[model samples]
Target: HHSHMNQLTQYTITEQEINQSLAKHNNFSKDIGLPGVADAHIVLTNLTSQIGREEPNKVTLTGDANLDMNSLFGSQKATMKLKLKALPVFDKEKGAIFLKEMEVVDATVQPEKMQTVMQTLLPYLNQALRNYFNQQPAYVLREDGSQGEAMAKKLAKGIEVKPGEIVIPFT
Candidate 1:
């Protein structure tokens, strides 16, 4: 027989905690090729998270992308400020938060010529990043965590993102 049937409550995760969780997944790199470019090395660094600044229920990640590629202009290098936005989804089975519908909302590359060239590769870069983050959980609910956390992990029905925090709503 069950003893407790508690009502649902909201669980909150702060921006600081999310950033701490993401520290291990920082500095992502990928190799992408385009026509006339032999090999393009794209590295994303210094990724910082902003919760609901641009929009409610979305997380925007602003970071630096260093591009190294071989083109007709010879070996070209450019640094880009890229802002990627995604919606956070919670998986009850895994008790994890995942990012979905990722897209490069804004990108600005330095050096005029390289900037033009970098424009052509934005879509590819977006896809590469999508592939990378799709598999990794941004945050996972710990089984051995606090009593409230354990309860939230088991009963959370959905998640909501506010200005500076994430709220997991229990059933």
Candidate 2:
């Protein structure tokens, strides 16, 4: 019957599909307490996804971060630009793609004077991105078709990055 010859061993998911999934579910928020001054609540939005463009082997996400702090020092609010770059990993148990080795790149916290907090903020920002993405899959395999069933039956080998796409091979 030579069904093995017709079996698919890999799939390509583009940045556009990944971005749509991010917009639908990955737009998230995290809270950072700046010690005695205030408890800053950061909401990250408009996360744009780019695959294999900047670093070739990494995925970059650029977004707008809005911060609001309230404390005895009064209220402070601002929007900072953020970029998070990470390596794509495949989780066989989860049947999805996750990000790892994350870092904050070219991120800027503004207000000029706010630069002092940038040092402390960096750690929190990195942790936040890692924690958030680690819990959420960037993309999940489909569960409703023959191709989906076929993919689910095999183990994912690895991930590869092309100019504008991410390829995942299965065994």
Report the lDDT tens digits of candidate 2 across residue range 1-171.
543434477767789988887787776788876656656678888877899988888899888988875567776787789888988888877777887767788778777656666556778778878888888888887766446344643656767888888887765
Instruction: State candidate 2's TM-score.
Output: 0.83
What's the lDDT for all of these models? 0.79, 0.76
lDDT of 1 by residue, 1-171 (tens): 134334347678877777777776655688766746655788887767888877788998888888887765578787889989988889888998877777899999887887766677777877888877777877888867566578779888788888998888875
Clash list (residue pairs), candidate 1: none
Clashes of each: 0, 0
Candidate 2 pairs with clashing backbones:
none
Give me candidate 1's TM-score against the actual structure.
0.83
